[PDB]
Design a protein around this ligand. Sequence first.
Ligand SMILES: CS(=O)(=O)NCc1ccc(Cl)cc1
Ligand SMILES: CS(=O)(=O)NCc1ccc(Cl)cc1
Length: 282
Amino acid sequence: MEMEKEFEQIDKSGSWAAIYQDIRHEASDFPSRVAKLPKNKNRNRYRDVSPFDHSRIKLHQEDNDYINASLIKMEEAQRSYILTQGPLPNTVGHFWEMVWEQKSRGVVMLNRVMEKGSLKCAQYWPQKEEKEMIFEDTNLKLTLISEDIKSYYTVRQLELENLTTQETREILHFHYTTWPDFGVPESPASFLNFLFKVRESGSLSPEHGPVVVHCSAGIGRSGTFCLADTCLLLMDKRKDPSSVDIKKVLLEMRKFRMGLIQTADQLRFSYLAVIEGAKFIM
Ligand SMILES: CS(=O)(=O)NCc1ccc(Cl)cc1
Ligand SMILES: CS(=O)(=O)NCc1ccc(Cl)cc1
């Protein structure tokens, strides 16, 4: 079908749970043997969320190359993304090692450090200019350069220094701060505005390594971000934009990381965002 009328037809028929379950049944399953080795237990936030062996990001260090992160490579759209969990106390140095080694220009954060009264990820970036962070395990230094706080999202400029070579790079931190503790946003307007700010920065462009995208597990909100971006790019590239099938794009992305889009409400929100984004583009 076409998207907007498939949308009203699922709303009128109340069948979001049945559509979402179909996706879960058809999704790829591949080995995640490295994630499950006992030496990696303290490198995983959740025992049921693991990167596939075939698409996992490898750290350039012989002792242990493991991080809970996946390369999502979208061939027709010509976009790549790294999707990862929120960093743990023991993995903040590995996180910045990956950003360095992969040549990323941007980090996209879709959660707060505390939500529902519990910690969802480590405080992994500095809050004050004059109080920089040193990761002794990974031999990196990170400095806050500037911060711009807006009503729905904050953008930070950071300096990452490789202490071994004294090389420096500028990293942009895009922090969506208003996703609700329960459910999904009522309107996709502020999420789409945010996506457009990340695009305008150059962080998603082929000149740079892939953007790093995370939430708590790196599958739900993170899934929604990459699914909306890829669907809107395909609608611009193709002769017939009504040919873009959001369910088929999501199953292609699930070949590279398990579990992307965690609820029927996140699936409906992804359709809503693509439908409203397609009108703004023209
Ligand atoms: C997690 S796993 O790698 O052990 N399972 C995936 C799987 C899919 C299909 C077949 Cl035929 C066999 C295995
Ligand atoms: C390779 S490095 O210089 O960036 N840091 C050392 C290191 C990295 C990763 C692990 Cl798992 C252990 C040690």
